[PDB]
Design a protein around this ligand. Sequence first.
Ligand code: NA
Ligand code: NA
Lengths: 359, 359
Amino acid sequence: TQCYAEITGWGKCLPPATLSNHDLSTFLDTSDEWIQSRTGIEQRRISHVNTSDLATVAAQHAIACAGVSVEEIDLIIVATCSPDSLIPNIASRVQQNLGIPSAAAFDLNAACTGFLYGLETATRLMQASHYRHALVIGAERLSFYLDWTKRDTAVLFGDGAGAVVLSKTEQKVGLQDAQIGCDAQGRDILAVPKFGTAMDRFDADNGYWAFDFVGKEIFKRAVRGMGAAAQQVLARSGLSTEEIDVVIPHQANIRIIQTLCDLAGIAQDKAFVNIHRYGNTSAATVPIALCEALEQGKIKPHDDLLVAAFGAGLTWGAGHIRWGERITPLGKSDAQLPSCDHTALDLLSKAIEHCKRHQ
Amino acid sequence: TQCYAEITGWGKCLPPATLSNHDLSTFLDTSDEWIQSRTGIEQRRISHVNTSDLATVAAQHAIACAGVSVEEIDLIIVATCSPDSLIPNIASRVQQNLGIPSAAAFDLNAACTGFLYGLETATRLMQASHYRHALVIGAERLSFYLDWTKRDTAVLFGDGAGAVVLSKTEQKVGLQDAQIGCDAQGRDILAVPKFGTAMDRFDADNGYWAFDFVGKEIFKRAVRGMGAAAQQVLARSGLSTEEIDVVIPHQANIRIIQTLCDLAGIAQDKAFVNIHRYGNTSAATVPIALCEALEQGKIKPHDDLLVAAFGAGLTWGAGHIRWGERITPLGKSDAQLPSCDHTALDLLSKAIEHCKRHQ
Ligand code: NA
Ligand code: NA
């Protein structure tokens, strides 16, 4: 008997400390004019807490939004490439924080495509086996990684988390067809090769790692990768392009999003965009954007959503989500991060000082 | 129409440098007598290459064993908690090394239960969607993490990789029912909290991290977790315990494996054990053990396998695999690691010196 994973809960956690384009302009040869025109980004958030904490708050909001009890959750996937720790995983920390008993809990790493990978994986696990409710979270603290002397990457990335709760049903809703993949031959153009077990653990300079980033090749391959994936999704599902009501894309560059819509013949005003506020938050982009699309009344019952993402790997993906009946939360959560009496510059102060002094 | 993921290929990669119990005895207050009697471990392997390289060789062997071409692989999961890098993932590095086009590729972290999680995930992905062949790899270089002044953990862990290839079929083979989970309340008893984004990136002492490990509580919870999971698997499948032909367990302690069989009423001689040779290789234990069980003629066509694992999280799992017709490789691979003209003590020399000098 055919089953589905309906998205019944959504939630986000953006940390409060805000790094503006002008803030970056004080310690870097860049400008608000260049950044906003090339990328669309105006602000990003910088976390004063760990990735697991951002993930926990978003999940709390999603659970309240779904009206599910913690004892109903059977599966927790955290999509991240910036986990607090590797032993143990941070899906288990989120589980511990929420008091969810027994659920399967793992971290998934597919970089910026991680939430799509996670939604796909959770959806298939639910359809093929005995998982009735899932929590899928994209959460990142990319500020940990940045080279504060390197303008090419330092202005692109932010911190945050988004979550969904999935509920098993016989109604034809949630993620339908999905096409995810990886173009591995281009792996080297977007990489931090020396954070991980490849790094020299006892070298005192091991913190001063390179963030390889070939913006132009990334731009080109992302358009092509997402584009092809979206076409496969639309083709297999028998949908005309006008039947897509909303695009929820990965938020890496506004011009990538525009080019994607243009080449697919999707009207620009169907794309939800919040990159101006948050920047590229990797695995978090899609579920935050989905959460806010719902908050802002952009999605209607029964809408067809196109999701699309791309990332280091080079990972890629697209998916068709058919929304159900409810675009309103069942409940609200007063869950919050601890207060932060610091600016974004204050938080990055030490890291910036070290990066400049080492150069 | 009901589909299955048959295990058609298996492979392993053990690095050649061998750390004996006596080797550990020279720089640590421990002995071969204590280690072998408490844990069963006599030797472990210490890698001279990165995790991705171990994963690549095992995958190569598995592909040759399955007789599949690299263009047929649709999905690559690497289970690891010791990846070379976080950006990008190492599933993509394995993909790049093998020349596999387009496949979905992600890293999964559920610590020592990672391979079970990965097998489950790949199997459900294949059953519910359009993935025809998968590569699932457990790969670890745990020697990166160890505190060479701490005997409690330094003698338990080794390096290695194991892989399987899965092929979609209508025959009722491969992983059948599976029960995976996580008991998150005991998360703090097995942890390296300060490797990851929680660590101070610019502290020169950030390499001297604690490896928290409460052996006794871990022992007790592992028996109970795996035991309960195995019972659920057996119960749901309508199998009597005598119908299990082989147990392929996680290899963390021989006494855990024995207790598991004892309490389930499974005969001890059905458990495949190689912990004496390799130690605890985390996500790699199960697929290396499976690979060697097949190499050594322990598995017959149509056998029922019980798999069980446990790990940091505390993650846990069990699964029933029904084997198919073939226990022999279709082909062999001459794929090898680069030669290593060093001992295990030679390789660890620098790390050991730093750990001792810092104390
Ligand atoms: Na429609
Ligand atoms: Na049998």
